[PDB]
Amino acid sequence: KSCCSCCPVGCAKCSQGCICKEASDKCSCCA
Ligand SMILES: [Cd+2]
Ligand SMILES: [Cd+2]
Ligand SMILES: [Cd+2]
Ligand SMILES: [Cd+2]
């Protein structure tokens, strides 16, 4: 885990702020 369970790796969109709050197995706001 880095930021979320869908972007557990300081994802870009999740650079410095888990701005991804939607993905119960997959997201479409980032990757
Ligand atoms: Cd995520
Ligand atoms: Cd993200
Ligand atoms: Cd996140
Ligand atoms: Cd996302």
Swiss-Prot record:
Protein name: Metallothionein-2
Species name: Rattus norvegicus (Rat)
Residue numbers carrying Phosphoserine: S28
Gene for this chain: Mt2
Domain of life (superkingdom): Eukaryota
GO molecular function, one term: metal ion binding
One GO CC term on file: nucleus
Residues that, per the record, bind a divalent metal cation 4: C3, C4, C14, C18
Binding site for a divalent metal cation 7: C20, C27, C29, C30
Known function: Metallothioneins have a high content of cysteine residues that bind various heavy metals; these proteins are transcriptionally regulated by both heavy metals and glucocorticoids.
